[PDB]
Design a protein around this ligand. Structure first.
Ligand SMILES: CC(=O)c1nc(NC(=O)[C@H]2CNCCN2)sc1-c1ccc(C(=O)N2CCOCC2)cc1
Length: 130
């Protein structure tokens, strides 16, 4: 309905604002764009489902997220992918892992403080009705 599309537009505005705040954080610069194949050709090999904050923005604008749960699944994928690609005890690996967990924790904390649970419930009930 027209009212339901108003609800999803509000969700998109909220998700763009959260993603923008993550993308401007210097800690998260490594997650802002897709991995360049000419710089790292072996990334495409190990990581089967690449995700980054620019691609999240693209999916918001393509209306792919109907709930905050669907959005947080892609945030979680950014984090899990980084841990997968960086399993060594080496400090370069440990730094990326720390930043990836901070990205995940920051997104969840913003959502916990700023998303009304009733708004998310409405989004989920509209989604389940389709
Ligand atoms: C994103 C990610 O997970 C990742 N992990 C790395 N791991 C290392 O550098 C470790 C690997 N294990 C050995 C020590 N170094 S490097 C790395 C990584 C860092 C930068 C890019 C990159 O080209 N861009 C392009 C635009 O800006 C955003 C990121 C891709 C992968």
């Amino acid at each position: 309905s027209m009212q339901e599309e108003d609800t999803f537009r509000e969700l998109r505005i909220f998700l763009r604002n959260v993603t923008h705040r993550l993308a401007i954080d210097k800690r998260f610069r490594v997650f802002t764009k897709p991995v360049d194949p000419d710089e790292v050709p072996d990334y495409v090999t190990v990581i089967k489902q690449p995700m980054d904050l620019s691609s999240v923005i693209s999916k918001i604008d393509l209306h792919k997220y109907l709930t905050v749960k669907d959005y947080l699944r892609d945030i979680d994928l950014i984090c899990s992918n980084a841990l997968e690609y960086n399993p060594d005890r080496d400090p370069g690996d440990r730094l990326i892992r720390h930043r990836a967990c901070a990205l995940r924790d920051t997104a969840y904390a913003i959502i916990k403080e700023e998303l009304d649970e009733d708004f998310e419930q409405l989004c989920e009930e509209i989604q389940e009705s389709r």
